[PDB]
Amino acid sequence: IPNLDIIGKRIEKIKQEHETSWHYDQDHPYKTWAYHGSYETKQTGSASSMVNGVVRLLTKPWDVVPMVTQMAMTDTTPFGQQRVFKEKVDTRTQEPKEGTKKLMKITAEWLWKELGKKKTPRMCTREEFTRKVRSNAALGAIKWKSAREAVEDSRFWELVDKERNLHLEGKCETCVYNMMAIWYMWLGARFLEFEALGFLNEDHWFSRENSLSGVEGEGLHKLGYILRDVSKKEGGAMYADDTAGWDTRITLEDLKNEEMVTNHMEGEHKKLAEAIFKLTYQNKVVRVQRPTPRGTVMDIISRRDQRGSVGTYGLNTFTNMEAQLIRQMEGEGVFKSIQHLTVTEEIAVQNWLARVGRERLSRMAISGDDCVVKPLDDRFASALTALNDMGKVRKDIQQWEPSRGWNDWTQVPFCSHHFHELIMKDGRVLVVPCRNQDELIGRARISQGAGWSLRETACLGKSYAQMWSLMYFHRRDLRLAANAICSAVPSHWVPTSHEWMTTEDMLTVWNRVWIQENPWMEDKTPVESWEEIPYLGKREDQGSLIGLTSRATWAKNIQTAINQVRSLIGNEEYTDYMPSM
Ligand SMILES: CC(=O)Oc1ccc2oc(=O)sc2c1
Ligand SMILES: CC(=O)Oc1ccc2oc(=O)sc2c1
Ligand SMILES: [Co+2]
Ligand SMILES: [Co+2]
Ligand SMILES: [Co+2]
Ligand SMILES: [Co+2]
Ligand SMILES: [Co+2]
Ligand SMILES: [Co+2]
Ligand SMILES: [Co+2]
Ligand SMILES: [Co+2]
Ligand SMILES: [Co+2]
Ligand SMILES: [Zn+2]
Ligand SMILES: [Zn+2]
């Protein structure tokens, strides 16, 4: 089942740009994706990640930690792409049963209606898009060189209009994904997607206020508070099951339910969004590279159901909200059979959604595929037939083994973190985020771009340091490492583009984020120094693999390393920041 009436125009346009080498490789490796052909291509990508030499020189004890080192070994060569494709992306998900589909359709229709109560969809503009391009951007493959180049060249916008008018007659020609697993599109295709669906992000449809379950806009320093509030609900344990490869488990049915947001639109906006949904989401064309004994080729493949990562405009959050409501329903015995929803069962679901729907959403904190649920009681743990039949198979657990929850919200994993209460010297109680400090250091030692000069490398380092001092100040090693990086990088250099991304005094930012603007901090008295700001317990702070001897030596000689970095940056002026205790 590949529908060439929808994808043929895209495939033929690519075939015609490489007619000489175009061919059908009878030994292609694709099993659940439809394969259309290959052509010869120049190898792109690389098999190493680039190391941030500034962060590395100031974090020398971590040169021997395995987690840290391994993180610097990403493979975007054809070899790497094909490795991840075979293991992760080339999977099939069964179609949900009839009953499951009915639950999803009812629940999705209800959810769009709740999200739309206080919001109205709208088209986003070329001007909105262009302003966002002048900053951090969603990721498209880039004929110009940068996104900021394309937005000014008005020929770029003629191409947009060309594709847009095809979209307006239900045809698609250039919206092709590239697996260079992350999927890129031409910036023009990204614009059309933004124009149709950007309102979901820009108008904050998944903020906690509008969606009850969501946390769009919250910010790491707020998530722990949000978890602790959810824990105040009456109910069972708190559950936080990860889905194995969520993007690959998005079904065609999921995509059709997300599309019901178009029922809330009108005019050409509805037509454009319908094009994004039917032409680019439910009928995708993907380019992947593959090594062959004859050099690297590009494969053209297609598939209807999965999702490709930029975010997903809240659609992953939407679908997870829907999926977790249905698991709540199943736990509460609202329905009995995935096989067939009886007429009286469809009415119960409708009643349940009308009666307790909003309350059940607020038992949840959901960010894309990341969810925390505090259900009515622990029947939830073994309500599994809808979850599995929807394809949202739980990671690292037997299919019918019941979920394990937690009674202590400080043990619940959410958004790659745990959250802890932390007592200040004056007795006020902070809720702070926590995650393995060897991961944080490993990610800081990776320069997110290839071929970078030392200034941008130093500014990326400073960005992590300021983030550490805001978010992970309670970790002794990170506070010290942040101090060194900030001492080593000229004080007026701007961190690369969030609260840590200026040259504001970071104590000023700390006070604003954790005291002044913290809705869960009643006493608005600021702190007057970093010595006033506490650490986690020395025990629980140990979490790190580094030896105590190499940490002590690192701490004792840290100024030697700082000066070494200062010398390579240049005859500049630097500030010696308050040394961590
Ligand atoms: C937009 C929002 O507030 O939701 C999230 C989800 C995951 C996450 O991981 C971080 O580092 S911050 C963060 C925020
Ligand atoms: C706890 C500590 O002293 O670490 C930092 C980190 C970043 C920063 O940015 C400034 O201007 S001050 C400052 C201190
Ligand atoms: Co050719
Ligand atoms: Co080529
Ligand atoms: Co996974
Ligand atoms: Co169909
Ligand atoms: Co209309
Ligand atoms: Co999302
Ligand atoms: Co009740
Ligand atoms: Co950052
Ligand atoms: Co509050
Ligand atoms: Zn298109
Ligand atoms: Zn911890």
CA distances from 372 to 237, 251, 411, 430 (A): 10, 22, 12, 21
Query: Phi-psi region for residue 92, left (φ > 0), alpha (ψ -120 to 50) or beta?
Result: beta
Q: Which residues line ligand 2 (CB under 6 A)?
A: 465-466, 469, 479, 482-483, 486, 505-506, 530, 577-578
Q: What is the DSSP letter of 572?
A: -
- SS3 of residue 316 by DSSP: helix
- Report the distance separating Cα 64 and Cα 66, nearest Å: 6
Residues 25 and 8 in one domain: yes
Residues 69 and 96 in one domain: no
- Of all ligands present, the nearest one to the C-alpha of 277 is 12
Question: What type of residue is 21?
Answer: S
Using the atom order of ligand 1, give the atom closest to the CA of residue 416: 9
Q: What is the largest CA-CA distance in the chain?
A: 78
Sole residue written with tokens 């880039």: 142
Q: How many domains does the chain have?
A: 4
Pocket test for ligand 2, best of 500, 506, 562 (most atoms within 8 A of CB): 506
CA 88 – ligand 8 centroid, Å: 20
Structure tokens at 258: 């997300």
Residues 476 and 394 in one domain: no
Residues 245 and 220 in one domain: yes
Q: Which residues line ligand 1 (CB under 6 A)?
A: 215-220, 367, 415-416
Using the atom order of ligand 2, give the atom closest to the CA of residue 483: 4
- Report the distance separating Cα 344 and Cα 365, nearest Å: 30
Query: Phi-psi region for residue 49, left (φ > 0), alpha (ψ -120 to 50) or beta?
Result: beta
CA 484 – ligand 9 centroid, Å: 53
Residues 462 and 488 in one domain: yes
Of the candidates 365, 381, 415, which is a domain's last residue?
A: 415
Residue owning the nearest CA to atom 10 of ligand 1: 220
CA distances from 151 to 131, 202, 572 (A): 10, 19, 36
Range of the domain at 250: 92-123+198-281+305-415
Sole residue written with tokens 């509805």: 270
Pocket test for ligand 2, best of 477, 483, 502 (most atoms within 8 A of CB): 483
Structure tokens at 216: 């769009």
CA 551 – ligand 13 centroid, Å: 19
Sole residue written with tokens 């599994």: 384
- Report the distance separating Cα 2 and Cα 8, nearest Å: 9
416 within 8 A of 435, measured Cβ to Cβ: yes
- Report the distance separating Cα 294 and Cα 414, nearest Å: 46
Q: What size, in residues, is the chain? A: 581
Residues 243 and 165 in one domain: no
- Of all ligands present, the nearest one to the C-alpha of 371 is 1
CA 297 – ligand 13 centroid, Å: 46
Residues 193 and 209 in one domain: no
Question: What type of residue is 107?
Answer: T
Residues 40 and 18 in one domain: yes
Using the atom order of ligand 2, give the atom closest to the CA of residue 469: 6
56 closest CA partner among 481, 551, 581: 481
Please give, one letter per residue, the 3-state secondary structure of 267-301: HHHHHHHHHHHHHHHCCEEEEEEEEECCEEEEEEE
Using the atom order of ligand 2, give the atom closest to the CA of residue 479: 1
CATH number, residue 33: 3.30.70.2840
According to DSSP, the β-strands at 183-184 and 284-292 are: unpaired
DSSP 107-149: HHHHHHHHHTSS----PPPHHHHHHHHSSS----B---SSHHH
Q: Which helix (H) or strand (E) holds 374?
A: none
Report resolution in angstroms: 2.4
Query: Phi-psi region for residue 157, left (φ > 0), alpha (ψ -120 to 50) or beta?
Result: alpha
374 within 8 A of 240, measured Cβ to Cβ: no
- Report the distance separating Cα 558 and Cα 484, nearest Å: 7
According to DSSP, the β-strands at 177-179 and 284-292 are: parallel
CA distances from 466 to 105, 495, 556 (A): 45, 8, 22
CA 278 – ligand 6 centroid, Å: 9
295 closest CA partner among 42, 35, 75, 17: 42
Crossing angle between the packed helical segments 476-488 and 454-471, to the nearest 10 degrees: 150
Of the candidates 415, 430, 447, which is a domain's last residue?
A: 415
Residues 385 and 421 in one domain: no
- Report the distance separating Cα 468 and Cα 440, nearest Å: 9
CA 267 – ligand 7 centroid, Å: 4
Using the atom order of ligand 2, give the atom closest to the CA of residue 473: 1
> How many helices and strands (H and E) does the chain possess?
24, 11
Of the candidates 415, 439, 466, which is a domain's last residue?
A: 415
CA angle 264, 267, 272 (to 5 degrees): 85
- Of all ligands present, the nearest one to the C-alpha of 259 is 6
- Report the distance separating Cα 455 and Cα 495, nearest Å: 10
Q: What is the DSSP letter of 394?
A: B
Residues 218 and 86 in one domain: no
Pocket test for ligand 1, best of 208, 211, 223 (most atoms within 8 A of CB): 223
CA distances from 194 to 130, 285, 318, 431 (A): 11, 19, 17, 35
- Report the distance separating Cα 490 and Cα 465, nearest Å: 13
Residue owning the nearest CA to atom 8 of ligand 1: 415
Residues 110 and 248 in one domain: yes
Using the atom order of ligand 1, give the atom closest to the CA of residue 471: 11
269 is in an annotated binding site: no
459 is in an annotated binding site: no
Residues 367 and 348 in one domain: yes
